[PDB]
Structures are given as structure tokens and as C-alpha cells.
Amino acid sequence: TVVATAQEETKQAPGVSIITAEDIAKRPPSNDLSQIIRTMPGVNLTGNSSSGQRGNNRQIDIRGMGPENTLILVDGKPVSSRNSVRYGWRGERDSRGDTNWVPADQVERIEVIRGPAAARYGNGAAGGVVNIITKQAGAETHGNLSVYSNFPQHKAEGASERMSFGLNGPLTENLSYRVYGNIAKTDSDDWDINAGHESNRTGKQAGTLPAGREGVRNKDIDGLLSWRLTPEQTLEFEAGFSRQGNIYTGDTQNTNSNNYVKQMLGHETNRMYRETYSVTHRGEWDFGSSLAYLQYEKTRNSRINEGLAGGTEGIFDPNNAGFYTATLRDLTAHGEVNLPLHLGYEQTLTLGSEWTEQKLDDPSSNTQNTEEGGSIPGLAGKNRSSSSSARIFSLFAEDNIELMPGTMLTPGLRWDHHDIVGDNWSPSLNLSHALTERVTLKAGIARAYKAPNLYQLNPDYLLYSRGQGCYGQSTSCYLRGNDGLKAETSVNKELGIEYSHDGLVAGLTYFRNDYKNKIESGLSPVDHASGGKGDYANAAIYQWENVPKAVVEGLEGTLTLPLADGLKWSNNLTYMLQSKNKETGDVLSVTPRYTLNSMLDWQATDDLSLQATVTWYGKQKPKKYDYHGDRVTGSANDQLSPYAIAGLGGTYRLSKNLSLGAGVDNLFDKRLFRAGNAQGVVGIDGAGAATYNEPGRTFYTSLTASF
Incomplete structure (x- = not known):
């Protein structure tokens, strides 16, 4: 009786959780799937950057590794869209992330793959992988129509409404379709939600506010045709078109303001179009199995012009009104075969390859001139190219080996060639061992891989500061992209033991990641520019640089008890032991010290x-040090205390064809308000860990019609 693939076997690792369509129906999200994905052990909902900048745009973070290290897939195929949004000095991105491209009610399940079992997915899987799997066609035609609406207690908080539908099943004998559509709106929080709560602001900055959550408008449609060619051979064509337009409520990088900001309150100021095309060929053959695919993903990011420095840094530029478009083109090709091998040991060998290309055209990001800080040899002050690109070819080999009943060993090797950075090797080993019929011991260790992003890699990408932003000094500097960076790698391990019997589950897992060469803004000048104006002339030139060592470490626990026949009590617990950048001694990602769901x-x-x-x-604790590397003081030290969020809801089945849902999230109305960024700037104190809004009590209803 044949052994599963490597890819399938490691879905039982301690660091894997599965969320089903039934889980999603019972706990419906407002809109973005992050709201349910975050409730898995070892998962957090976190700002992109430890600076707090754009800190209400929280995203899925795995095991404290940061949202940039969460690789998102849809039906196994990568989502890259957030790479069209400029990555700034502090790793901030004015992006809502990549977990809102698929409507919740057309999702079959979600695989959350954390740590060593994720390494095999290659570039970007150092925290882990979130694979969102869409409902597919079956034998007969089936379909659904699903509506959801919510109702905040406090009018300052944005309400969401959401309508989607699926239809799938045969069209002819050889030919079947699956299509869905979706329309959604999450309103923005009100412009003044955080009035009463903001960091102290003086002088020019009196009257400024940190913004609440940005709204969003989604239109999604997807169409897939499945064509049974030979008995061995299915060919699938799929096109997807999504648009997200925002609803702006005053977010700015530093939480300052101007009239262009005040004027755009409540309007669309950024829009993302994502286009996907894929062809997928599946074979079922005598020898085993095959899968190949090609995906093209085109992302257009159009938004209002902002500055890179000066008075318009990270804010709408009133002297360059209007919008620009950045374009990201990502092509991914993948092939594999799966071979049951029967001699010696039972096992299943997987052999494969992948090629990706990423092209980025960004006409706002490479425009910082050198007139103030001085000129930089090899860098043209003006008219630098918009474009950047990189390609990675990959080879891999994996084998899932039944050493003997109850024991599986799953070695794998990935090799990657990045056409600028060079070669990578990602060894992988995960295993399971039955200690009794009820208790299993599992362990894993692997080296994940993440290539530099195209901002960090680009010598034409240049940022400038008069002093505030410069590490180890107070005079003016530049931060320059660096196309000699190393790749980031992370040796990620876990050890897990789990009792399991009769739907009773008790389990405990320890994890640690030794995160190598994390890419960050440099700490020392590599050089000095020459000329410029006044005190700012001859600015120090810093580079994007590899940090030698960082570590995360902690524990995940699970306890599921069957209290009685219709009554099940599920718990999971995550405890963060460390999240440290071992060069700066500072925090890597700000997460709660523990999370118990x-x-x-x-x-x-x-x-x-x-x-x-x-x-x-x-408890949540902010960065210890400011951009200079000096000890933070004052309200920039502020921590969030522990807190709880409770909810209640239900589903009533009126028939095979109609179900309704209702409930309340945050039952005791426990609210937190964004006070600012972690550290302050001239006129605006920092707020430490108080960088986000936690919404209050929110009622909801849903209806699902199906057949």
C-alpha cells in the first residue's frame, strides 16, 4: 500500500496546521483571511516593520520571523503582489499584504506550514508557508452563493460586507469548469478614531493623528476550465482578475499631515490590480504521478505620489499631485514527478524543478537625487532606471521512506541558482516515529532560503536622511541598494510529541530558527558622498547589509478535549522565548509574549x-533602540499589557440548501488604539508597542445558499 509523497507526508509535521472550509464557516472573517489564519499556533498578526510605520496594516507572521518571511500560495502557486510596493529603510511597506486575494467562502482549506516542513517550498519560506486552496469541481454541477455583513458597536470602526459565488461541474464529458466571483467592502476606520489616544505632538505637529485601519474594496473573479485529455491526462486553464481599491483614512509614514492628506480622507488613494494566468497539466500514469504548471502574475500598484525624503517623506506630495503605477511581473514554472519505489524500503521519490522570474518597474522608488548630500560615484543623480529583475532556477529531490511501520524519514535537497546572488543549498529532513499506538514523536530540521528583494538588491535604489535616520551618527546619510548581498538562510528545527486518541489531542512542540544574513539597513558607512549643500554635504553612504545572526525560539501547545458527544473544547498555546537580532541586540518582530486560543x-x-x-x-514590548542605535526613552518604551478577546456565534441549517450564521466578535468590547510609531520624530513622540487598532465589539450575519 503506497507511501505518500514528501510534500504530503510533511503536512503532518508538528509545525503544520490545517484550516477547513467548515472552520471558516463557523468563524467567518470580516474580509482578509488573515483574521482566521492568525488563530493557528505559532502564528501572529503583526506590522511589517518594527518601526511601527504603516503599523495598522498587520499581516501574517510565522513564529516571530516577520510577515516578509511568510510565503503565500494559492493552490500551490505563489503570490508576489506585495513586492510591487516600495520596501523602505525600516522594512516598512505601505501594503495590506497578500492574504486578501481569495474570497473566504470559496476556500476549500488553508495549509499553514511553519518551520522545517516549509523550507522545501524555497525562496520566501523561512518563516513558513500559507497555502490557500480553492474549492474545485467534482462530478455533478454544484455551486454556491454566500453573503456576509458586519455591524461594529462603535461607529468609528469600519464595517464590512461581502458577497461571493461559486459555480462548477461538467459542461461536457471531457470538460468541466470552476468559476467564482466576489465583491467586498471593508470600510476604513474614521479619521479621528485615535483622537484621545495619540502620542504627544508639539509645534508644527500639533493636531496630527495616527490613523486607524485603512479600508478596502475587492472585486475578484476567477475561471478555470479542466479538460480531461487522455485517461492519464488533465489540463487546466485558469485566469484570475482582482482589484483592490483602498479607503484612505490619513495614514502617513511618520503620522504627520498636510492638506493633500486631509483632502483625500475617505477617498481611494491606492489601487492594486492583480492578474493571474496559469496552465496546469496533471498526469496519472503507470509509474506514478506528474505535475507541471506555468503561472504569470501581473500586479499593477497605482497610488498617489509621495516623497522619499524632506517635508514630503512618506506622505502625499502636494507639489506632484496625481498617481504613478509600479508594475510587477512574476512568471513561475514548475515541474515534478512522483515515483513509488518498492525495493529495499517502501518509499516515494519526488524529483522536480522550478524557474521564476521577477520584473519590477517602479518609477517612484529610484528618484532620490544627490543634490543635498553630495554625489555618489557609480550612481547618476537623475533619471535612473525604473526597472529591476532577477531569476532563480531550482532543482530538487525528496524521498519519503517508511523505515518500518510507524516510522517515516523524509530527506530532501533543494538547489537554487539566483542569477545575481548565486547558488543556494537547502537541505531538509523531517521524520515521524510512533512510540505507542497513541503517541508520536516528530522532529525536523532544514535550511530555508530567501533571496534579497529587488529594492534591497538595486544600486539605483537610494534613500536619504538629514540625520534622524542615520545609524551611529547624527549627520546626513544615504542608504543604497547593494547587489552583492548574500541571500538570507534560516536553519529551522522543531521537536514535537503528541498524544492522540478518540478525538483527544494533547501535544507540545519546541521550535528554534537560526536566522542567517537577514537583510537590513547598514550600521556603518562604507563610504562618503562628495559635495552637496551646507552641513549636509558629503553625506555618509550606508548600504543594505546582511546581519550575521538572529534567532527565534518558543513553544506551541495543543489541547483538544471531547467534553461530551456534541461538545468539543479546543485550545492552542504559543509561547515566544526569543526574537532577537543578535547584532543590534534588538527585537526582530514585535509579537505578544504568548497567545492562547x-x-x-x-x-x-x-x-x-x-x-x-x-x-x-x-505583553508586547517595542524596540529598545532608535534609528541611531541609542537607547529609546520616554513613551517610546511603552508596552501593551496582556488582554483577551472573546466571541460567540452559531450556524443554523435551514435545509440542505440554506444555512445562516450570526454572532459577535470581541464580546466584552476590549479596544486598543494606535498612538503612533515606535520611536518619535521632531514634534511627535513615539508610542512604543501601541502601534495598531484592535477593533471593538462587532456583530455579524451570514447566509450560504448551495447545491
């Missing part, structure tokens, strides 16, 4: 299902 699920009748949830978060 608890759910009581009651099948009250055949037709009626009720749920209660509570989540407890521990």
Missing part, C-alpha cells in the same frame, strides 16, 4: 451549531 464547539442540534471563543495575548 480557546474554542468551545457545541453541536446543539442536528441543525444548530454554537461556538464560543476566547483568545488571550501576552
